[PDB]
Structure 1
């Protein structure tokens, strides 16, 4: 059993259904093979390996897959890019992400870190090997990570470098909080998301506790994003093919008193989007008729820390995504590819 750190082209595997018209199944049918019928996980005795989730080529490869998936599935009525405009066809699609497995070809293996407290960087003491990752749903979103896996013990704070304020922080929850979003059947663009504020505020208290530990028992304060475009100032995500933008100010107010019922976030279905794939603008068709509803699990939070305040008494955090690679990272963090030397 000898190996060395290496990079290589992965392949993908899924349980896509060949009869399904849903666009993730369509994509997986022709670009992935069926998932491993008998997956095998070999434990490595007294092996210690070093991982680095911020420098992991698997993330880059998943990003390209999802870009390609979106480019052949959600085609927009009009793409505006670098001076050129292109009008295409934009029929309403069936959209519901499915888990994708990433798998190494012959000569390579995936090492899997099984330390329950692992924060993404540093040495792992409980390593296994696998031919494929577990199945990861490629959920595109900002501010909140949805429908992901949970941390197994305590809330985990993940950052390439906590001291650097421009480094995005990933909070990995150990308890999911449901967010239930609805555009009622009968303003067709107006919608809302319902969160159990009791559940949310309690989990958010535990996040502050955890952030305290890393920040010298200082005063932890949350605040809405300090400007930017709507995809970053709002919790943005796609629901049955429709782009939802949800004001999360009520989630990131430190108030929490008589605040512990249901939190209704005001939302909008937008037709003009600032693409996350490549720089540009895409215009999609107005929303389908009827009740549009998505019930998801908040499994993590994307946070950006306010810079320039070392001699202040407190650290403020704001929600902030946009770089979808961090979404992939929050699930690939325990994997790394190695060449069997």
Structure 2
């Protein structure tokens, strides 16, 4: 006996918890381009020196499908999207009886309409007719001379996005507040979520960019080894599966249409930017994929799924069965306009048990959108005048169920990205924040002065 208790301020202990974070991005575009939708007009700049410390002898258990960093990311981008659209031109007097006719094809695919209507002019007393153009599926028939209707006027409002807003995703660091720390896993093969042995305590995450993609993730991060397979629950086929590419496949998307900005003043100052007549031929949008480079990626995936999924059953790769055309096609915002390249061409290959040609995909463009199934308010995308090219790295895949097969064999995973939060999980699978507790009591024979 005769042991006393002693206090220690500065002890390294923590408990699993989550709180608010903040943005961090250095000097990116500022003057040459500004008014970004993600970095806002000003965010807390990150320091070039990276805050990193390697932790030894520690094996903290992470979690990815129960991590709340993706939850705050999901909800931050949503409130950020609306904050950058509230001060922009509303498009309410654009819901008037549209009388359209098919475009000039030498009296003979269609996909677009040379439509018109009459709107408000600078004077509310006077009205003005202007002929613009619209895309298919942005409009659906009402009930000779075709008379059409904006599809959104049936369900929700509409507000045009601002023309000087940059929709390019830039790296947005999520750094921890004071008294907290973001633990990153350094173990390469982090199957599922368990006890990651190689941990690093970093203050600022890496360059995370908010790629708004569907079925196929682009510009993601990865750190070697077999193409990693992550699933909240491997036995349940109903759950979604995130897949990471040991090497990215360089893809290029573009639209050949040469459009023109037609500004028409609605009301006092606001102007509605629509499509004029398309100059220099009309062509369909497409995304190329390296055919030889894709056959190796589908082979590496099926190899590591094999020891994961019995390694005895048959591979059945099909198009995204069911769903909606925006949730089953590779939907993504690129170059201002919103592409929806046809996925069904990639997963036609089936491989089981033991200058150069490139596969391409037909794509269409949509101007009316309200992503992540937000039915509150929709937005019109002004057609970007001139040329468009995307040319991004693809690094991830989103695959979903394969029916309720009762035992037997034969199954895979067809593409579905029904949830937008999973897209951010491909970057935050290794991060978890903890509540640092600097207080720690321990006994030791040790006492201060007797009387004082």
Superposition TM-score, scaled by structure 2 size: 0.69
1:77/1:282 contact within 8 Å kept? no
Aligned with 1:230 (options 297, 316, 325): 325
Contact kept, 8 Å, 2:292 with 2:358, in 1: the verdict is yes
In the alignment, does 2:406 pair up with 1:305?
Answer: no
Q: Is the 8 A contact 1:20 1:26 kept in 2?
A: no
User: In 2, Cα distance between the equivalents of 1:150 and 1:26?
Assistant: 23
Q: Does structure 2 conserve the Cα–Cα contact (< 8 Å) formed by 1:59 and 1:332?
A: yes
**1:113-262 maps to which residues of 2 (within 5 A)?**
113-184=185-256, 185=258, 186=280, 190-217=284-311, 218-254=313-349, 261-262=357-358
| Higher relative strand content | 1
- Which of 9, 31, 34 aligns to 1:19? It is 31
Aligned length in residues? 337
Q: Could you say if the C-alpha distance between residues 312 and 14 of structure 1 is closer, same or farther in structure 2, counting changes exceeding 3 Å? A: same
Shift of 1:26: 6.8
In 2: Cα distance, 1:222 partner to 1:187 partner: 36
C-alpha displacement at 1:215, in angstroms?
Answer: 0.7
Note if 1:97 corresponds to 2:169: yes
How far did 1:107 drift?
Answer: 0.6
Aligned to 2:179: 107
Deviations 1:295-328 (A, max 9, x none): 1111010000213113231113111113111111
Q: Are residue 284 (structure 1) and residue 380 (structure 2) matched? A: yes
1:325 is matched with which residue?
421
- After superposition, the Cα gap between the structure-2 partners of 1:24 and 1:323, relative to the gap in structure 1 and judged at 3 Å, is farther
Q: Post-superposition shift, 1:44?
A: 1.3
Query: Do 1:13 and 1:28's aligned partners in 2 also have CA atoms closer than 8 Å?
Result: no
Q: Which runs of 5+ in 2 are unaligned?
A: 1-11, 93-151, 259-279, 438-452
Larger Rg: 2
Gapped runs of 5+ residues in structure 1?
Answer: none
Structure 1 residues 26 and 137, CA gap change in structure 2 (3 angstroms): closer
SS at match of 1:195: strand
CA contact (8 A) 2:15 2:435 kept: yes
* RMSD across aligned positions (CA): 2.4
Alignment deviations for residues 48-93 of structure 1 (CA, whole Å, 9 cap, x no partner)? 0111100111101111222133224466865959955244565364
| Partner of residue 55, structure 2 | 44
CA–CA distance in 1 between the matches of 2:47 and 2:164? 32
Distance change >3 Å, CA 25–CA 155, structure 1 → 2 = same
Bigger drift between 310-319 and 99-108 goes to 310-319
CA distance, structure 1, for counterparts of residue 79 and residue 281 of structure 2: 33
Deviates more, 1:218-227 or 1:6-15: 218-227
SS of the residue corresponding to residue 345 of structure 2 reads: coil
**Structure with greater helix share of residues:** 1
Rounded Cα–Cα distance in structure 2 between residues aligned with 1:323 and 1:187: 38
Q: Normalized against structure 1, the TM-score is what? A: 0.91
1:166-195 deviation per Cα after TM superposition (whole angstroms, max 9, x unaligned): 211011110100110011244868310011
Which segment drifts farther, 163-172 or 185-194?
185-194
CA distance in 1, matches of 2:306, 2:370: 35
Q: CA 1:12 to 1:264, structure 2 compared with 1: closer, same or farther past 3 Å?
A: same
Change (3 A) 1:23 1:151: farther
Deviations for 1:221-260, whole angstroms, at most 9, x for unmatched residues?
211111111112211101012100000111010257xxx8
